Amino acid sequence: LTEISVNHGEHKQVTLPDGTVVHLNAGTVMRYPTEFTSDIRLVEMEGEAFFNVMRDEGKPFIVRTRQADVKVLGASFNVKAYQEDELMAVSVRTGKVEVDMPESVMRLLPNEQIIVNNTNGEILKKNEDAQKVTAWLQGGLYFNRTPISSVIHDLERMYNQEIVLDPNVVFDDYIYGEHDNKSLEAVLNAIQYSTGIRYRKEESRIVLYKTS
Ligand SMILES: [Mg+2]
Numbered sequence: 501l502t503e504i505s506v507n508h509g510e511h512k513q514v515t516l517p518d519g520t521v522v523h524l525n526a527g528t529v530m531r532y533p534t535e536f537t538s539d540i541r542l543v544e545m546e547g548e549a550f551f552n553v554m555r556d557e558g559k560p561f562i563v564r565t566r567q568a569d570v571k572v573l574g575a576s577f578n579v580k581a582y583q584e585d586e587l588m589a590v591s592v593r594t595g596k597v598e599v600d601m602p603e604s605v606m607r608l609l610p611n612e613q614i615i616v617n618n619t620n621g622e623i624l625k626k627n628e629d630a631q632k633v634t635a636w637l638q639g640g641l642y643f644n645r646t647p648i649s650s651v652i653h654d655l656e657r658m659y660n661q662e663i664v665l666d667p668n669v670v671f672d673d674y675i676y677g678e679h680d681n682k683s684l685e686a687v688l689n690a691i692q693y694s695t696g697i698r699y700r701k702e703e704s705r706i707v708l709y710k711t712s
Pocket of ligand 1: 526527528529546547
């Protein structure tokens, strides 16, 4: 078994022993064997990774996360499952994907997604543009009615910058937009434009707030 991790502000790309390509986003850990010797190709992951799985009908590939197993024969898909986040999501780019959870099994096709809420156990299957979901691969951000708390975790991880919400302010906002390789400052300005949320820098801390 080997394990790789990705620091905040970084990515990694790895090719697995079966030829599967995995792109790992900031803050992610993945554990995999140097050889797939069993009847399944199993990896364990916490964080976010995009898998382009080499087709082997004879040997399913399983991405095992705390919340779910994602099982394919040959497919490309994103798994966003940061242990610190309120949401986990699996989004299919190509092929067919099975998501196995304790009390739910669902099959997904391209541009379908499952969102699991880690805090209240809700499970939502819906449509979503997987090309936008996976914009992170090219340094993009994509928000589609994304809760501000989740946005902030994405920003912290992307930019390697601590960002906290003013505890005396209500942050009930949902964020929309696509940002292509923007500065943190620019992304925060765009949020300000959309929500009124302001930001100020402190000793190694950005604090978000509101006024009026
Ligand atoms: Mg992490």
